[PDB]
Design goal:
Structural class of chain A: mainly alpha
Radius of gyration of chain A: 29 Å
Chains A, B, C: Autophagy-related protein 9A
Distance between the termini of chain A: 28 Å
Number of strands of chain A: 4
Largest interface: B-C, 32 and 39 residues
Oligomer: part of a larger assembly
PDB class: lipid transport
Entry title: Cryo-EM structure of human N-terminally bound ATG9A-ATG2A-WIPI4 complex
Number of helices of chain A: 19
Strand order of the largest sheet of chain A: 1-2
Order of helices and strands of chain A: HHHHHHHEEHHHHHHHHHHHHEE
Strand content of chain A: under 5%
Keywords: Lipid transfer, ATG9A-ATG2A-WIPI4 complex, single particle cryo-EM, autophagy, lipid transport/membrane protein, LIPID TRANSPORT-MEMBRANE PROTEIN complex, lipid transport
Organism of A, B, C: Homo sapiens
Chain lengths: 475, 475, 475
């Protein structure tokens, strides 16, 4: 808690993260688990590929370790694979980089832990329940005693929001003003939205944190971008930068594709074998987490709003009528139940129904038919609230398309309310497709917008006295 | 969309019906299905009786069509049945009358379609979805351009209600003022209420639409009924009319009993076969639909109120349970669970406790016993205030007997709240008994009330300027 | 229905009990079942111990009665057991005492049954629904025509309350003013609360109903306890009385432990084998039934309040979960589901990786592991630990520690709301430990308080004109 011992943002963000991952110990364990998952996916995969003798395992009493080959041979069998050794070297370099960042991160988090205990006085035991609210108000009271910022008024913390959410307000305003290509017109489908984890990572790596980004400090925009002139040369430089970052993405495509493959397998294939309908449930759509966001909104406030409003949204996706069918169901149930009631009364009367070549099969098929129809027959006295569903979901979200409020029941509303609330399976598919799709969108659809991106960052970037360079809307 | 081509009722009612059966294509299909159900019931009703050789089917590998007799013989075997041929001729005449009415109805519904599309501008695609208010908001605004009927009155915004519900407000006021015999004092039972579909049909055929009814136009009462004098001769004429309509009912009794027999038997029994407890669920009744109904209330508003308030009413009807049985359940569970715990501890200890002469059956039977008892044991901590709940049922239904609010928990309240809420099975029984019961109630219990019916229709019938002759209460 | 003939407290109490056990027949059956449960536990246990030949039953087709020994030998084998015969003689003496008390209990209850039928006019059929308020209204209206009570004073509807609840108001005020040792400071745990069924029985046997209690009549305090002087000799006498009652408890310890050890094992061992999580549900804690209870509150009013407020309290107790445990669950689910997905893909591919003598078992195990973790993984929402959940639990019960309202989310609040919420396993454990714990608390922790108990009963005991000697608070 040394005074002005650092820029405000890399300190405040860490403080917030420590509050979120409830405490230093929890956070440390979480990071360690995150590192062990990567290493386990890679090592389990390379063990399955390289060391196991599938033939003996399958056909040719056999104990499990009868399959595995001895290490003195596994090392040679994995080493004589140029492709495998190359993938493992790149994987190990990424891993070592992540482990080094982890060590540096915990050495910097012990400082935030001491900050809490000694200057905020919130022990790690009282932290899962201390509440964000407690600390955010509290630090502001600490600003008097344990001084921070060389020249600082007590933190309104309004600013503090700004520190934690500087680049996220920029993403919110970029997506809000329709820069950043998301909408695509696919043949055979409507206008798809393709916004993933990797794509937003690339957008932030291009714009905010890198070698030659728009920002030099993490709290100050480079000096040329504030100048009205020379906009065209800056646009050309940004276009070339994003071209080469897209080409790096295109070259790293195979490795990230392989990664998205295995982790998912383990992550989902289990769920598929258990409950194949868990992937039919719907999730709140990375595009949609950025669309339904609200000014200077920390992650936990957005997620509280998003799950307060989740069950109304599932009831909506669930609700619409399909009425003509209903009639087909009712009448098919009538005719099938009639023929089945006759055949059932006969088989009850004499019990020699059998020996008819198709009888028994007829009773079974008719039973299936009646059950399907009765499932399609709506339950009577089942209430319907189209108006309410397109009202309570909004009450939890607070943002709406202006052409949804009237026609809540149409396919236009469902089709674009779907993208915001889209189902897990298309989420897993869309995260699989991002390695192969992100470079081409990055090269083709964003490079034309570079001159508009430059004008955004020149026009909408205010210098607020305490915080530095923040988005103009987030004020 | 033309001007006053047909009675407003014969136009407004059709418009409303087209909105309800969501669209012309739906309406047609529904009517066609309604015609095919009648013909299908009667067909087999006659194929099962006449063409199938049950002896060969039962006992004397046999393919299904080994039972059926060739048509060249089925025609002769069905033709040499005077009773069957007579029932079929009457059935075919009723059918042809219904088919002719259907053709005329769709030829008149196309006109209405065109009304929607061209003057209201609501396509059949946006209709299931139009919503009631909007049509209301459309028809009344249209009254300016495509002028409505006489156009005498601009739309009242009540006028349409009176037009659609003229005779139904009369039924509501008749049942509300205790004309129209419903209560009966059966021996061995309390005061039963017998109000069916056929009985209300007969009441409307007697009073409203017929050769010599009270009404001549469908919107104007005959001129003599407005006169105070000659009430006694009018009462005698009405009594003779209802006598002869009751005698027509008594003569048609066998056929409606059969049809009631045939159409019902097929449907419900299979369901019982499937789930015999579906007939233990309770439905609102023709009565009760007429008791809880406001005056100018379209069918969909009543049904919305009736199913909003259905689950509270089922929670009420299921709330009273025997104290004594509970005790038997608790103690049978104790003794069975004790013997089973001993036998389970033994089979766990040695595992050869099993394979004993009674071993693999006592544990199973005791498990079934404990499960049945635990199902009969009420849930401790279960909160039921019978008295409190009726409150929510009232908040939905909106009407009640005064002597219910205090004693919500007695057998008097349940017994006559039972009548409003009776379970399906007594509904199906009560619709079966109506062919044989409706003529005798119609001849004996209503003919004495004819002089009160005449005084009702003379006293409570107002002439409203735009709509004609409407009930006096429905104002 | 006699003219104020026998001590009132008892007559009214019996009347109330007859209303509770809904009717004479029900009550009689309940008591008979209570007597048969004791005899069945004892006889089944002595049959299992003494008559069954376990060796033949286990190993050495065998019919069940091949195990049992003939009675001519069972009698000799049970008789040559001094310990067993002694326990059986004490058990039979307690039983005969209970059967004799039951006899009259019913000979005195036929009088209350005749009271109902002839003076209150509530048949036993209308009694499960007659309700308390009306009866109260019936008894108080009956007071006039038919003589009852001294007649010095007419009933006033609170007299009946004092009569039924004289000693229970004393218990409420004793526990409310922190006499009666309940809080203990165990090493390795917080301050435990140990209040059981046997402990409260002993407190009432010491204070209220016995040979030398504080009360001589059941409605009048002995004359010396009202005197300010001689308090020290009275304190010494009370201390000696409670010493010797504690020593009787210590000597009866083995027998009550046996029954407690016994009955309990039998009672929940069945439930354990069925649903091991039924013992994880929580119950309302004998301490807590006495803490949350108003003064003049009959048992059914307290229990109505206690179950109206049960589900809010379970929602509170389940709302706080360890994040760490959450993280361990998430990551154990990941690693187990990964290994299982691999093994499942193999057994699907070839089917001879299936039922690897080792694999099939693990697959299940791993399946058990994934299911346990997924049960520990939180699902969305329910994380509030809200002021609001408390704000409804309080609205039910109406009493909370004052340091609860602010910090509803801390471990201090959960830990001492925990004591009120009583998860059952502990109940069953705490009812098992009471035979061995009640004598030592009774000898050591209560005997020092005897001088404060004497001062309580001298200071807080008012003589109300109609009822006698009642607690001073219950006014």
């Amino acid at each position: 808690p040394w005074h002005h011992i650092e820029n405000l943002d890399l300190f405040f963000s860490r403080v917030y993260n420590l509050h979120q991952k409830n405490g230093f110990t929890c956070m440390l364990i979480g990071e360690i688990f995150e590192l062990m998952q990567f290493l386990f996916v890679v090592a389990f995969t390379t063990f399955l590929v390289s060391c196991v003798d599938y033939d003996i395992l399958f056909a040719n009493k056999v104990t499990l370790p009868d399959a595995f080959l001895p290490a003195q041979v596994c090392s040679a069998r994995i080493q004589e694979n140029g492709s495998l050794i190359t993938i493992l070297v790149i994987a190990g370099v990424f891993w070592i980089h992540r482990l080094i960042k982890f060590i540096y991160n915990i050495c910097c988090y012990w400082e935030i832990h001491s900050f809490y205990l000694h200057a905020l006085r919130i022990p790690m035991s009282a932290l899962p329940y201390c509440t964000w609210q407690e600390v955010q108000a509290r630090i502001v009271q600490t600003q008097k005693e344990h001084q921070i910022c060389i020249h600082k008024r007590e933190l309104t913390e309004l600013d503090i929001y700004h520190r934690i959410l500087r680049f996220q307000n920029y993403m919110v305003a970029l997506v809000n003003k329709s820069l950043l290509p998301l909408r695509f017109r696919l043949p055979g489908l409507g206008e798809a939205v393709f916004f993933t984890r990797g794509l937003k990572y690339n957008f932030e790596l291009i714009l905010f944190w890198g070698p030659g980004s728009l920002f030099l400090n993490e709290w100050s925009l480079k000096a040329e971008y504030k100048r009205g002139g020379q906009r065209l040369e800056l646009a050309q430089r940004l276009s070339n930068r994003i071209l080469w970052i897209g080409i790096a993405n295109f070259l790293l495509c195979p490795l990230i594709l392989i990664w998205q493959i295995l982790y998912a397998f383990f992550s989902y294939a289990e769920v598929l074998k258990r409950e194949p309908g868990a992937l039919g449930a719907r999730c709140w759509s990375l595009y949609g987490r950025c669309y339904l966001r609200h000014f200077n909104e920390l992650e936990h406030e957005l997620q509280s709003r998003l799950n307060r409003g989740y069950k109304p949204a599932s009831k909506y996706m669930n609700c619409f009528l399909s009425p003509l069918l209903t009639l087909l169901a009712k009448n098919g149930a009538f005719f099938a139940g009639s023929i089945l009631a006759v055949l059932i009364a006969l088989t009850i009367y004499d019990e020699d129904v059998l020996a008819v070549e198709h009888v028994l099969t007829t009773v079974t098929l008719l039973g299936v038919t009646v059950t399907v129809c009765r499932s399609f027959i709506p339950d009577q006295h089942m209430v319907f609230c189209p108006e309410q569903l397109l009202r309570v979901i909004l009450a939890h979200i607070h943002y709406m398309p202006d052409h949804w409020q009237g026609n809540a029941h149409r396919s236009q509303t469902r089709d674009e309310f779907a993208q915001l609330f889209q189902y897990k399976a298309v989420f897993i598919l869309e995260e699989l497709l991002s390695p192969i799709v992100t470079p081409l969108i990055l090269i083709f659809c964003l490079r034309p917008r570079a001159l508009e991106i430059i004008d955004f960052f020149r026009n909408f970037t205010v210098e607020v006295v305490g915080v530095g360079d923040t988005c103009s809307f987030a004020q």
